[PDB]
DNA sequence: CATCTCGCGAGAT
DNA sequence: CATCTCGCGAGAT
């Protein structure tokens, strides 16, 4: 996978630290949405699920998960943006490998519920 | 975050001597001094700052998040950031306080929604 | 903005209640002019616009509005004076927040009349 | 009741400050159970919901809330017991009245889900 | 499932 | 009225 550049969402925001091209991804979140996100998410857990709601439509979340495998045709949550969220969580919160694993189980859990309600 | 030129003759929410905790706003200085004089608590200043910053028609269709059963719009996050910056810089409120103040703001918009349905 | 003191208009008058310094502005209106105003304006609406004609020249009213923003180079009507006008209407009439809103539209509407005719 | 006596549950346990007769309530939690609570509940928020389950059966929780006032004809969780929970969480975590307030919505929300299962089974 | 926390209408100050 | 704060159902974690 390849990183991107500002020209990919000129009206967007950087996930990660803008200073480190090795660990930064541009995304479509406009700055005011990010102001709100960075204001109301006091843990890496809650900002990871919130960034997700802001980057993956729940139509997509219902048919997707991290690995793109599993029953019922699970597609794969776009990897450039998943790299973005990890870049951001480590930038803002300094998460560990232990942490990222839990955040990955909750990302998948959230997509599981999005699928759960296209069922009902 | 905005610059002063966004409202040449407006006012600053928050600390003017902190470019990260200040939001230029359209409140005229006349009115701001009145807000600083006759709003002696964070809770009242929040609800009256709200009315100087958002028409009651925006308030009716809006809540703090944009989520909700009602297809609601979201109160401009730059302005809400300034409300918050200002309440910190004058009353020095905690985030617990800020949390409970924030429920009052949803509550106000929610009664605005009620009136708009009458 | 900063309140003034009596020494700013010794032959002037006080807008507001003279007893708390935090809600009184000294203005240049002579007391005789003030006697005519209080006897002749039986509403805050009417007194605000009459007060305005006594503190802002029509020259100035035509160029200005309350925001100092808008089209055609609006200048901001002096805030200390505006603070005084509202200090006065709450002293004499007890106006509410809703009331102050319409009166601000009146003041601005009246500034529009002064500008429309400056170039008729 | 009024701040009960230890004879009310001779072989039970104390909620709160044992050497403070106004901030202690005697309850029927057996001592092995209380030890388990003291060991495995590491926060006031979990201790409250866990204590709830040891002092009120599910069927009581279903038709109860903290105040007794509700759109439904609810009953009130025995205020003496709720006092003890409160005394306890403060005795062993030094919780704020702000905390107690938020913890008390958690209690009310738990009984609310107990209501939900009773009508789903 | 247990628990947290939300948006909500409407009763209380 | 304007504002506080409640009980609630249910989504989020």
Author numbering:
A (entry chain A), C (entry chain B): 205 to 324
B (entry chain D): 207 to 324
D (entry chain C): 205 to 325
Please, what does the article write about this entry?
The BEN domain, which is named after the exemplar proteins BANP, E5R and NACC1 (also known as NAC1), is found in diverse animal and viral proteins and has been shown to constitute a new class of DNA-binding domain (DBD) (1–4). Over the past few years, studies have demonstrated the preferred DNA sequences for some human BEN domain proteins, which can be roughly classified into two groups based on their recognized motifs.
In the complex structure, the BEN domain of BANP folds similarly to the BEN domain of NACC1, with two N-terminal β strands followed by five α-helices. In detail, the long C-terminal helix α5 of the BEN domain is mainly responsible for DNA recognition, as it inserts deeply into the CGCG-containing major groove and makes close contacts with its neighbouring bases and the phosphate–sugar backbones of the target DNA. However, in our structure, two BEN domains recognize both CpG sites in the CGCG motif simultaneously, indicating that, to recognize the CGCG motif, oligomeric BEN domains may be needed. When the CGCG motif is recognized by two BEN domains simultaneously, the combined effects of recognition by two arginines from opposite directions of the double-stranded DNA result in compression of the CGCG motif.
